[PDB]
Design a binder for this molecule. Sequence first.
Ligand SMILES: [Mg+2]
Ligand SMILES: [Mg+2]
Ligand SMILES: [Mg+2]
Ligand SMILES: [Mg+2]
Ligand SMILES: [Mg+2]
Ligand SMILES: [Mg+2]
Ligand SMILES: [Mg+2]
Ligand SMILES: [Mg+2]
Ligand SMILES: [Mg+2]
Ligand SMILES: [Mg+2]
Ligand SMILES: [Mg+2]
Ligand SMILES: [Mg+2]
Ligand SMILES: [Mg+2]
Ligand SMILES: [Mg+2]
Ligand SMILES: [Mg+2]
Ligand SMILES: [Mg+2]
Ligand SMILES: [Mg+2]
Ligand SMILES: [Mg+2]
Ligand SMILES: [Mg+2]
Ligand SMILES: [Mg+2]
Ligand SMILES: [Mg+2]
Ligand SMILES: [Mg+2]
Ligand SMILES: [Mg+2]
Ligand SMILES: [Mg+2]
Ligand SMILES: [Mg+2]
Ligand SMILES: [Mg+2]
Ligand SMILES: [Mg+2]
Ligand SMILES: [Mg+2]
Ligand SMILES: [Mg+2]
Ligand SMILES: [Mg+2]
Ligand SMILES: [Mg+2]
Ligand SMILES: [Mg+2]
Ligand SMILES: [Mg+2]
Ligand SMILES: [Mg+2]
Ligand SMILES: [Mg+2]
Ligand SMILES: [Mg+2]
Ligand SMILES: [Mg+2]
Ligand SMILES: [Mg+2]
Ligand SMILES: [Mg+2]
Ligand SMILES: [Mg+2]
Ligand SMILES: [Mg+2]
Ligand SMILES: [Mg+2]
Ligand SMILES: [Mg+2]
Ligand SMILES: [Mg+2]
Ligand SMILES: [Mg+2]
Ligand SMILES: [Mg+2]
Ligand SMILES: [Mg+2]
Ligand SMILES: [Mg+2]
Ligand SMILES: [Mg+2]
Ligand SMILES: [Mg+2]
Ligand SMILES: [Mg+2]
Ligand SMILES: [Mg+2]
Ligand SMILES: [Mg+2]
Ligand SMILES: [Mg+2]
Ligand SMILES: [Mg+2]
Ligand SMILES: [Mg+2]
Ligand SMILES: [Mg+2]
Ligand SMILES: [Mg+2]
Ligand SMILES: [Mg+2]
Ligand SMILES: [Mg+2]
Ligand SMILES: [Mg+2]
Ligand SMILES: [Mg+2]
Ligand SMILES: [Mg+2]
Ligand SMILES: [Mg+2]
Ligand SMILES: [Mg+2]
Ligand SMILES: [Mg+2]
Ligand SMILES: [Mg+2]
Ligand SMILES: [Mg+2]
Ligand SMILES: [Mg+2]
Ligand SMILES: [Mg+2]
Ligand SMILES: [Mg+2]
Ligand SMILES: [Mg+2]
Ligand SMILES: [Mg+2]
Ligand SMILES: [Mg+2]
Ligand SMILES: [Mg+2]
Ligand SMILES: [Mg+2]
Ligand SMILES: [Mg+2]
Ligand SMILES: [Mg+2]
Ligand SMILES: [Mg+2]
Ligand SMILES: [Mg+2]
Ligand SMILES: [Mg+2]
Ligand SMILES: [Mg+2]
Ligand SMILES: [Mg+2]
Ligand SMILES: [Mg+2]
Ligand SMILES: [Mg+2]
Ligand SMILES: [Mg+2]
Ligand SMILES: [Mg+2]
Ligand SMILES: [Mg+2]
Ligand SMILES: [Mg+2]
Ligand SMILES: [Mg+2]
Ligand SMILES: [Mg+2]
Ligand SMILES: [Mg+2]
Ligand SMILES: [Mg+2]
Ligand SMILES: [Mg+2]
Ligand SMILES: [Mg+2]
Ligand SMILES: [Mg+2]
Ligand SMILES: [Mg+2]
Ligand SMILES: [Mg+2]
Ligand SMILES: [Mg+2]
Ligand SMILES: [Mg+2]
Ligand SMILES: [Mg+2]
Ligand SMILES: [Mg+2]
Ligand SMILES: [Mg+2]
Ligand SMILES: [Mg+2]
Ligand SMILES: [Mg+2]
Ligand SMILES: [Mg+2]
Ligand SMILES: [Mg+2]
Ligand SMILES: [Mg+2]
Ligand SMILES: [Mg+2]
Ligand SMILES: [Mg+2]
Ligand SMILES: [Mg+2]
Ligand SMILES: [Mg+2]
Ligand SMILES: [Mg+2]
Ligand SMILES: [Mg+2]
Ligand SMILES: [Mg+2]
Ligand SMILES: [Mg+2]
Ligand SMILES: [Mg+2]
Ligand SMILES: [Mg+2]
Ligand SMILES: [Mg+2]
Ligand SMILES: [Mg+2]
Ligand SMILES: [Mg+2]
Ligand SMILES: [Mg+2]
Ligand SMILES: [Mg+2]
Ligand SMILES: [Mg+2]
Ligand SMILES: [Mg+2]
Ligand SMILES: [Mg+2]
Ligand SMILES: [Mg+2]
Ligand SMILES: [Mg+2]
Ligand SMILES: [Mg+2]
Ligand SMILES: [Mg+2]
Ligand SMILES: [Mg+2]
Ligand SMILES: [Mg+2]
Ligand SMILES: [Mg+2]
Ligand SMILES: [Mg+2]
Ligand SMILES: [Mg+2]
Ligand SMILES: [Mg+2]
Ligand SMILES: [Mg+2]
Ligand SMILES: [Mg+2]
Ligand SMILES: [Mg+2]
Ligand SMILES: [Mg+2]
Ligand SMILES: [Mg+2]
Ligand SMILES: [Mg+2]
Ligand SMILES: [Mg+2]
Ligand SMILES: [Mg+2]
Ligand SMILES: [Mg+2]
Ligand SMILES: [Mg+2]
Ligand SMILES: [Mg+2]
Ligand SMILES: [Mg+2]
Ligand SMILES: [Mg+2]
Ligand SMILES: [Mg+2]
Ligand SMILES: [Mg+2]
Ligand SMILES: [Mg+2]
Ligand SMILES: [Mg+2]
Ligand SMILES: [Mg+2]
Ligand SMILES: [Mg+2]
Ligand SMILES: [Mg+2]
Ligand SMILES: [Mg+2]
Ligand SMILES: [Mg+2]
Ligand SMILES: [Mg+2]
Ligand SMILES: [Mg+2]
Ligand SMILES: [Mg+2]
Ligand SMILES: [Mg+2]
Ligand SMILES: [Mg+2]
Ligand SMILES: [Mg+2]
Ligand SMILES: [Mg+2]
Ligand SMILES: [Mg+2]
Ligand SMILES: [Mg+2]
Ligand SMILES: [Mg+2]
Ligand SMILES: [Mg+2]
Ligand SMILES: [Mg+2]
Ligand SMILES: [Mg+2]
Ligand SMILES: [Mg+2]
Ligand SMILES: [Mg+2]
Ligand SMILES: [Mg+2]
Ligand SMILES: [Mg+2]
Ligand SMILES: [Mg+2]
Ligand SMILES: [Mg+2]
Ligand SMILES: [Mg+2]
Ligand SMILES: [Mg+2]
Ligand SMILES: [Mg+2]
Ligand SMILES: [Mg+2]
Ligand SMILES: [Mg+2]
Ligand SMILES: [Mg+2]
Ligand SMILES: [Mg+2]
Ligand SMILES: [Mg+2]
Ligand SMILES: [Mg+2]
Ligand SMILES: [Mg+2]
Ligand SMILES: [Mg+2]
Ligand SMILES: [Mg+2]
Ligand SMILES: [Mg+2]
Ligand SMILES: [Mg+2]
Ligand SMILES: [Mg+2]
Ligand SMILES: [Mg+2]
Ligand SMILES: [Mg+2]
Ligand SMILES: [Mg+2]
Ligand SMILES: [Mg+2]
Ligand SMILES: [Mg+2]
Ligand SMILES: [Mg+2]
Ligand SMILES: [Mg+2]
Ligand SMILES: [Mg+2]
Ligand SMILES: [Mg+2]
Ligand SMILES: [Mg+2]
Ligand SMILES: [Mg+2]
Ligand SMILES: [Mg+2]
Ligand SMILES: [Mg+2]
Ligand SMILES: [Mg+2]
Ligand SMILES: [Mg+2]
Ligand SMILES: [Mg+2]
Ligand SMILES: [Zn+2]
Lengths: 149, 59, 64, 53
Amino acid sequence: MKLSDLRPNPGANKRRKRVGRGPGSGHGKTATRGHKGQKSRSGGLKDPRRFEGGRSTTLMRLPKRGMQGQVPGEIKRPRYQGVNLKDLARFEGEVTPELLVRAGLLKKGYRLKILGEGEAKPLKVVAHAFSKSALEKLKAAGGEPVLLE
Amino acid sequence: PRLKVKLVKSPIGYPKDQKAALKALGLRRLQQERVLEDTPAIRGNVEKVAHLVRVEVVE
Amino acid sequence: PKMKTHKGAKKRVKITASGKVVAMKTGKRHLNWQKSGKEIRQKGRKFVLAKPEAERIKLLLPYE
Amino acid sequence: ASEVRIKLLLECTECKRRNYATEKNKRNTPNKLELRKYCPWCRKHTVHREVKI
RNA sequence: GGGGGGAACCUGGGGAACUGAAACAUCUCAGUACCCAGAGGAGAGGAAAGAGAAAUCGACUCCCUGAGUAGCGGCGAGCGA
RNA sequence: UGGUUCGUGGAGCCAUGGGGGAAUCUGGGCGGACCACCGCCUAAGGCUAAGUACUCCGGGUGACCGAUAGCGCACCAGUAC
RNA sequence: GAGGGGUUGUGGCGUGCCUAUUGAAGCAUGAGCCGGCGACUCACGGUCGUGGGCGAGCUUAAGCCGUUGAGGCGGAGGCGUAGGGAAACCGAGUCCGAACAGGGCGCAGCGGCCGCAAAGUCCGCGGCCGUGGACCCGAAACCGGGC
RNA sequence: GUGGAGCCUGGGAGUGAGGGCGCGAGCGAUAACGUCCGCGUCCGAGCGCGGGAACAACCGAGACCGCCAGCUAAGGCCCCC
RNA sequence: GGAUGACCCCAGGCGGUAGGGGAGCGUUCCCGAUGCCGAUGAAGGCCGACCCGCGAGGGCGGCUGGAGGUAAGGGAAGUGC
RNA sequence: GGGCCUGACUGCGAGGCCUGCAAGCCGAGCAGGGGCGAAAGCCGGGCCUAGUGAACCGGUGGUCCCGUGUGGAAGGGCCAU
Ligand SMILES: [Mg+2]
Ligand SMILES: [Mg+2]
Ligand SMILES: [Mg+2]
Ligand SMILES: [Mg+2]
Ligand SMILES: [Mg+2]
Ligand SMILES: [Mg+2]
Ligand SMILES: [Mg+2]
Ligand SMILES: [Mg+2]
Ligand SMILES: [Mg+2]
Ligand SMILES: [Mg+2]
Ligand SMILES: [Mg+2]
Ligand SMILES: [Mg+2]
Ligand SMILES: [Mg+2]
Ligand SMILES: [Mg+2]
Ligand SMILES: [Mg+2]
Ligand SMILES: [Mg+2]
Ligand SMILES: [Mg+2]
Ligand SMILES: [Mg+2]
Ligand SMILES: [Mg+2]
Ligand SMILES: [Mg+2]
Ligand SMILES: [Mg+2]
Ligand SMILES: [Mg+2]
Ligand SMILES: [Mg+2]
Ligand SMILES: [Mg+2]
Ligand SMILES: [Mg+2]
Ligand SMILES: [Mg+2]
Ligand SMILES: [Mg+2]
Ligand SMILES: [Mg+2]
Ligand SMILES: [Mg+2]
Ligand SMILES: [Mg+2]
Ligand SMILES: [Mg+2]
Ligand SMILES: [Mg+2]
Ligand SMILES: [Mg+2]
Ligand SMILES: [Mg+2]
Ligand SMILES: [Mg+2]
Ligand SMILES: [Mg+2]
Ligand SMILES: [Mg+2]
Ligand SMILES: [Mg+2]
Ligand SMILES: [Mg+2]
Ligand SMILES: [Mg+2]
Ligand SMILES: [Mg+2]
Ligand SMILES: [Mg+2]
Ligand SMILES: [Mg+2]
Ligand SMILES: [Mg+2]
Ligand SMILES: [Mg+2]
Ligand SMILES: [Mg+2]
Ligand SMILES: [Mg+2]
Ligand SMILES: [Mg+2]
Ligand SMILES: [Mg+2]
Ligand SMILES: [Mg+2]
Ligand SMILES: [Mg+2]
Ligand SMILES: [Mg+2]
Ligand SMILES: [Mg+2]
Ligand SMILES: [Mg+2]
Ligand SMILES: [Mg+2]
Ligand SMILES: [Mg+2]
Ligand SMILES: [Mg+2]
Ligand SMILES: [Mg+2]
Ligand SMILES: [Mg+2]
Ligand SMILES: [Mg+2]
Ligand SMILES: [Mg+2]
Ligand SMILES: [Mg+2]
Ligand SMILES: [Mg+2]
Ligand SMILES: [Mg+2]
Ligand SMILES: [Mg+2]
Ligand SMILES: [Mg+2]
Ligand SMILES: [Mg+2]
Ligand SMILES: [Mg+2]
Ligand SMILES: [Mg+2]
Ligand SMILES: [Mg+2]
Ligand SMILES: [Mg+2]
Ligand SMILES: [Mg+2]
Ligand SMILES: [Mg+2]
Ligand SMILES: [Mg+2]
Ligand SMILES: [Mg+2]
Ligand SMILES: [Mg+2]
Ligand SMILES: [Mg+2]
Ligand SMILES: [Mg+2]
Ligand SMILES: [Mg+2]
Ligand SMILES: [Mg+2]
Ligand SMILES: [Mg+2]
Ligand SMILES: [Mg+2]
Ligand SMILES: [Mg+2]
Ligand SMILES: [Mg+2]
Ligand SMILES: [Mg+2]
Ligand SMILES: [Mg+2]
Ligand SMILES: [Mg+2]
Ligand SMILES: [Mg+2]
Ligand SMILES: [Mg+2]
Ligand SMILES: [Mg+2]
Ligand SMILES: [Mg+2]
Ligand SMILES: [Mg+2]
Ligand SMILES: [Mg+2]
Ligand SMILES: [Mg+2]
Ligand SMILES: [Mg+2]
Ligand SMILES: [Mg+2]
Ligand SMILES: [Mg+2]
Ligand SMILES: [Mg+2]
Ligand SMILES: [Mg+2]
Ligand SMILES: [Mg+2]
Ligand SMILES: [Mg+2]
Ligand SMILES: [Mg+2]
Ligand SMILES: [Mg+2]
Ligand SMILES: [Mg+2]
Ligand SMILES: [Mg+2]
Ligand SMILES: [Mg+2]
Ligand SMILES: [Mg+2]
Ligand SMILES: [Mg+2]
Ligand SMILES: [Mg+2]
Ligand SMILES: [Mg+2]
Ligand SMILES: [Mg+2]
Ligand SMILES: [Mg+2]
Ligand SMILES: [Mg+2]
Ligand SMILES: [Mg+2]
Ligand SMILES: [Mg+2]
Ligand SMILES: [Mg+2]
Ligand SMILES: [Mg+2]
Ligand SMILES: [Mg+2]
Ligand SMILES: [Mg+2]
Ligand SMILES: [Mg+2]
Ligand SMILES: [Mg+2]
Ligand SMILES: [Mg+2]
Ligand SMILES: [Mg+2]
Ligand SMILES: [Mg+2]
Ligand SMILES: [Mg+2]
Ligand SMILES: [Mg+2]
Ligand SMILES: [Mg+2]
Ligand SMILES: [Mg+2]
Ligand SMILES: [Mg+2]
Ligand SMILES: [Mg+2]
Ligand SMILES: [Mg+2]
Ligand SMILES: [Mg+2]
Ligand SMILES: [Mg+2]
Ligand SMILES: [Mg+2]
Ligand SMILES: [Mg+2]
Ligand SMILES: [Mg+2]
Ligand SMILES: [Mg+2]
Ligand SMILES: [Mg+2]
Ligand SMILES: [Mg+2]
Ligand SMILES: [Mg+2]
Ligand SMILES: [Mg+2]
Ligand SMILES: [Mg+2]
Ligand SMILES: [Mg+2]
Ligand SMILES: [Mg+2]
Ligand SMILES: [Mg+2]
Ligand SMILES: [Mg+2]
Ligand SMILES: [Mg+2]
Ligand SMILES: [Mg+2]
Ligand SMILES: [Mg+2]
Ligand SMILES: [Mg+2]
Ligand SMILES: [Mg+2]
Ligand SMILES: [Mg+2]
Ligand SMILES: [Mg+2]
Ligand SMILES: [Mg+2]
Ligand SMILES: [Mg+2]
Ligand SMILES: [Mg+2]
Ligand SMILES: [Mg+2]
Ligand SMILES: [Mg+2]
Ligand SMILES: [Mg+2]
Ligand SMILES: [Mg+2]
Ligand SMILES: [Mg+2]
Ligand SMILES: [Mg+2]
Ligand SMILES: [Mg+2]
Ligand SMILES: [Mg+2]
Ligand SMILES: [Mg+2]
Ligand SMILES: [Mg+2]
Ligand SMILES: [Mg+2]
Ligand SMILES: [Mg+2]
Ligand SMILES: [Mg+2]
Ligand SMILES: [Mg+2]
Ligand SMILES: [Mg+2]
Ligand SMILES: [Mg+2]
Ligand SMILES: [Mg+2]
Ligand SMILES: [Mg+2]
Ligand SMILES: [Mg+2]
Ligand SMILES: [Mg+2]
Ligand SMILES: [Mg+2]
Ligand SMILES: [Mg+2]
Ligand SMILES: [Mg+2]
Ligand SMILES: [Mg+2]
Ligand SMILES: [Mg+2]
Ligand SMILES: [Mg+2]
Ligand SMILES: [Mg+2]
Ligand SMILES: [Mg+2]
Ligand SMILES: [Mg+2]
Ligand SMILES: [Mg+2]
Ligand SMILES: [Mg+2]
Ligand SMILES: [Mg+2]
Ligand SMILES: [Mg+2]
Ligand SMILES: [Mg+2]
Ligand SMILES: [Mg+2]
Ligand SMILES: [Mg+2]
Ligand SMILES: [Mg+2]
Ligand SMILES: [Mg+2]
Ligand SMILES: [Mg+2]
Ligand SMILES: [Mg+2]
Ligand SMILES: [Mg+2]
Ligand SMILES: [Mg+2]
Ligand SMILES: [Mg+2]
Ligand SMILES: [Mg+2]
Ligand SMILES: [Mg+2]
Ligand SMILES: [Mg+2]
Ligand SMILES: [Mg+2]
Ligand SMILES: [Mg+2]
Ligand SMILES: [Mg+2]
Ligand SMILES: [Mg+2]
Ligand SMILES: [Mg+2]
Ligand SMILES: [Mg+2]
Ligand SMILES: [Zn+2]
């Protein structure tokens, strides 16, 4: 298995489309741009995700809703990330917020809330919050809901 | 996990406390299945009346 | 450079779980005295935007 | 609407919350509208009275 | 002791417009281009009358990240900690 | 008025052209109008390496150019004109 | 040297090229001819597709160490694992509502524990979009500082 | 009715100056190689081929390549032919 | 069919501007390469009625030229007028 | 024409018409609390089709959802206009 056997899988390394390179390519002359107009030009059109020919745009006629916020910005308040009991199945004995951030299910700076999707296990579960159903489940299954603050 | 306990042999002729264990499991009929939880208090009775039940380990 | 979120879209619209774009019905900001309760009520609910327009607004929200 | 045909709010006289918007020709109906409407706060019908919009 | 010079870099004092906003004035371009003064092999900054919510941190500078987030905005175009 | 993300906005903070104008710790500034509570910090003197920027200069190295290319100049080029 | 090359008398047929156009040999544009130069790119971000890695996870950035065309370390952070709600909040739900009503937006692999595939994510490649001058050439102009 | 049919989902477009002709009308003057719609067609993109003297769109007919073979379409069969 | 484009039989499609898609050719450069072709002649030039390829092209031969060129397979672009 | 009245409902809304979007349109049924009727029932303005104006920005009533260390407040949001 030498350097000359080193191939990429078919279609792994596709060739590029080259336009403006003559009649036989299918891309000659106008470079697949059409004939004239703003789109054919170098620099092209206004952003098609928004600009709509001058009329009030689809997005701009929709109304706003909700609190957008004021300076000095976001209010610092406790943030809760939910974690379903199903995602606790892998653990043994004790689960804390720290273990859940290592395992990759809970995000740092987020307070822990257990949610009831899945089946509870006889684990000790230290969390900042428990849903009505997650609490009920975790009791029935011989778990120890440890409430934090 | 969970338990699916099925009463397969009759308590008739077994001691009162093995009879009571089925009462604690909710097993009243032969071949009656109940999908219980898997806790040591619920598991202790199942081990008591092991010879009468047939346990499934549904999750 | 990295694309910037369009804040008009962010402030008007929400990308639902399955990728739908939901917004507030237009037409009840003002001029409501002569509008049937049916009109005021139904215009207070959210609607799902038409596919083409939903797909343009989603591109404006590249970090939701 | 016009200057003679004003827009107005109907106000539940019991809890005072404006619950309905409508109109009236105040040349033909100068006195305040009194009308029994269902008040969603009182959850019952109520003398609603005309109030300035 | 000063003077003057030095490619680019740096700080300070001043400071556009085309352009973008598919017109345009706020806005943008941009405190950019450019002018000027000064510095130096760098320059600035620097040892909390700070941060801002951690009962926390501990000068400054610089990179990554936070984050195109928080916000700002004819709440438009965009700007952006 | 400027700076800040903050375009007057509930607009604080930092700076300051004008007017008014304190106190020395039981003094004062700050935590985004403001008030209270609770904290944080010590203004109106100065200096301070290093980490950072640049490349006239020397060297090293290119899936960089190879004389219409590569610097405007491979050559008596900022020349001839 | 039963073939081929060069030439062209006669006969048949026959309206340059490019561009622009509804339509050009067109008496519409461009080109005297030749040689060289000459126009869809790159970065970051996005989106979709695709080739692999791994998979309820995936991945590092700056740096640090090594190398001197050697790679590794680095988990800060990023995306995903949950949504609904303006939000407080609740959460496989949530929002509206008096509702246990109705509705909106949401919520569940193939084979005999093993493979197979996979959410997702990372990297490569490709198309296209965004930001840059963004396919190349071209104004008339505007502004600054000088002459 | 298996068709370069249709349907769903997604990537990429280009086009958004049409024109002739037949028919249906409107406008015009029961004018226009006029104009504006409707249905169809062709040209556009079939300025490739046959006919129509020549001639995008009338008739004939949808050109993958080769043949010093055959049959036809329109139109033709006195000579040009 | 046979088994997976191994090639063969049958059938059908194959005008085309904008434009979509697919497959290729060639140019410069990197790995392959401390290799290999090369003065018994590199590249480049000029011929060829020869061979291969639908084609872009690739061979081959003669002349010129006088020192470089660079395979299979991949990689990257200042890539074709 | 007359009697009683306020359904010129609140919360919704199956299903559609229309339609590039955004809009526009019709709507049975369920719940709340009503109106008329003996009742069946009818009533979510008007025989019907015009009587209209997306967003942004702000006003007012409600709500009591956010409140920048905390409690308040400023200011927002939400419902209605
Ligand atoms: Mg490539
Ligand atoms: Mg590309
Ligand atoms: Mg291709
Ligand atoms: Mg190419
Ligand atoms: Mg070509
Ligand atoms: Mg193509
Ligand atoms: Mg084409
Ligand atoms: Mg051309
Ligand atoms: Mg194209
Ligand atoms: Mg393309
Ligand atoms: Mg294009
Ligand atoms: Mg054209
Ligand atoms: Mg065109
Ligand atoms: Mg052109
Ligand atoms: Mg055109
Ligand atoms: Mg044009
Ligand atoms: Mg075009
Ligand atoms: Mg240009
Ligand atoms: Mg342009
Ligand atoms: Mg307009
Ligand atoms: Mg926000
Ligand atoms: Mg701040
Ligand atoms: Mg325990
Ligand atoms: Mg027995
Ligand atoms: Mg017995
Ligand atoms: Mg006993
Ligand atoms: Mg906005
Ligand atoms: Mg509205
Ligand atoms: Mg409103
Ligand atoms: Mg309002
Ligand atoms: Mg009305
Ligand atoms: Mg109504
Ligand atoms: Mg009303
Ligand atoms: Mg309502
Ligand atoms: Mg993010
Ligand atoms: Mg001096
Ligand atoms: Mg001087
Ligand atoms: Mg000096
Ligand atoms: Mg300055
Ligand atoms: Mg300056
Ligand atoms: Mg000036
Ligand atoms: Mg300007
Ligand atoms: Mg610009
Ligand atoms: Mg732009
Ligand atoms: Mg402009
Ligand atoms: Mg413009
Ligand atoms: Mg102008
Ligand atoms: Mg500026
Ligand atoms: Mg400069
Ligand atoms: Mg000075
Ligand atoms: Mg000096
Ligand atoms: Mg230094
Ligand atoms: Mg210094
Ligand atoms: Mg200093
Ligand atoms: Mg000090
Ligand atoms: Mg983040
Ligand atoms: Mg981020
Ligand atoms: Mg700025
Ligand atoms: Mg001031
Ligand atoms: Mg200010
Ligand atoms: Mg300002
Ligand atoms: Mg404001
Ligand atoms: Mg301010
Ligand atoms: Mg001050
Ligand atoms: Mg002052
Ligand atoms: Mg003190
Ligand atoms: Mg004091
Ligand atoms: Mg102060
Ligand atoms: Mg102050
Ligand atoms: Mg203060
Ligand atoms: Mg503070
Ligand atoms: Mg405060
Ligand atoms: Mg104090
Ligand atoms: Mg402090
Ligand atoms: Mg120094
Ligand atoms: Mg030192
Ligand atoms: Mg230093
Ligand atoms: Mg350096
Ligand atoms: Mg550099
Ligand atoms: Mg050098
Ligand atoms: Mg070269
Ligand atoms: Mg060389
Ligand atoms: Mg030369
Ligand atoms: Mg030169
Ligand atoms: Mg030469
Ligand atoms: Mg030189
Ligand atoms: Mg020269
Ligand atoms: Mg000379
Ligand atoms: Mg011969
Ligand atoms: Mg001959
Ligand atoms: Mg001839
Ligand atoms: Mg003949
Ligand atoms: Mg002709
Ligand atoms: Mg040609
Ligand atoms: Mg033209
Ligand atoms: Mg013309
Ligand atoms: Mg001619
Ligand atoms: Mg001529
Ligand atoms: Mg002319
Ligand atoms: Mg000509
Ligand atoms: Mg012209
Ligand atoms: Mg031309
Ligand atoms: Mg000439
Ligand atoms: Mg010639
Ligand atoms: Mg040439
Ligand atoms: Mg491109
Ligand atoms: Mg480039
Ligand atoms: Mg790119
Ligand atoms: Mg991409
Ligand atoms: Mg990818
Ligand atoms: Mg992997
Ligand atoms: Mg080495
Ligand atoms: Mg997530
Ligand atoms: Mg949310
Ligand atoms: Mg509510
Ligand atoms: Mg629901
Ligand atoms: Mg549903
Ligand atoms: Mg896999
Ligand atoms: Mg994958
Ligand atoms: Mg695109
Ligand atoms: Mg640029
Ligand atoms: Mg460009
Ligand atoms: Mg581009
Ligand atoms: Mg002039
Ligand atoms: Mg001007
Ligand atoms: Mg001017
Ligand atoms: Mg002027
Ligand atoms: Mg001047
Ligand atoms: Mg077809
Ligand atoms: Mg088709
Ligand atoms: Mg494409
Ligand atoms: Mg287009
Ligand atoms: Mg077009
Ligand atoms: Mg047009
Ligand atoms: Mg025209
Ligand atoms: Mg047109
Ligand atoms: Mg027409
Ligand atoms: Mg026309
Ligand atoms: Mg047509
Ligand atoms: Mg006709
Ligand atoms: Mg006829
Ligand atoms: Mg006709
Ligand atoms: Mg007509
Ligand atoms: Mg006549
Ligand atoms: Mg005509
Ligand atoms: Mg006619
Ligand atoms: Mg006519
Ligand atoms: Mg036609
Ligand atoms: Mg055309
Ligand atoms: Mg034809
Ligand atoms: Mg055709
Ligand atoms: Mg023809
Ligand atoms: Mg023709
Ligand atoms: Mg012919
Ligand atoms: Mg003919
Ligand atoms: Mg003909
Ligand atoms: Mg003839
Ligand atoms: Mg004609
Ligand atoms: Mg015959
Ligand atoms: Mg005949
Ligand atoms: Mg004849
Ligand atoms: Mg005959
Ligand atoms: Mg004859
Ligand atoms: Mg055919
Ligand atoms: Mg074809
Ligand atoms: Mg294909
Ligand atoms: Mg080539
Ligand atoms: Mg090639
Ligand atoms: Mg090289
Ligand atoms: Mg080598
Ligand atoms: Mg070699
Ligand atoms: Mg040799
Ligand atoms: Mg030789
Ligand atoms: Mg070469
Ligand atoms: Mg050849
Ligand atoms: Mg040779
Ligand atoms: Mg020789
Ligand atoms: Mg050599
Ligand atoms: Mg090679
Ligand atoms: Mg190769
Ligand atoms: Mg290789
Ligand atoms: Mg080029
Ligand atoms: Mg009547
Ligand atoms: Mg009456
Ligand atoms: Mg009546
Ligand atoms: Mg009564
Ligand atoms: Mg519906
Ligand atoms: Mg619609
Ligand atoms: Mg209408
Ligand atoms: Mg009732
Ligand atoms: Mg009733
Ligand atoms: Mg009822
Ligand atoms: Mg009754
Ligand atoms: Mg009734
Ligand atoms: Mg009804
Ligand atoms: Mg009406
Ligand atoms: Mg009536
Ligand atoms: Mg509006
Ligand atoms: Mg606006
Ligand atoms: Mg407002
Ligand atoms: Mg509150
Ligand atoms: Mg509170
Ligand atoms: Mg507070
Ligand atoms: Mg108090
Ligand atoms: Mg109070
Ligand atoms: Mg308030
Ligand atoms: Mg309010
Ligand atoms: Mg409203
Ligand atoms: Zn009331």
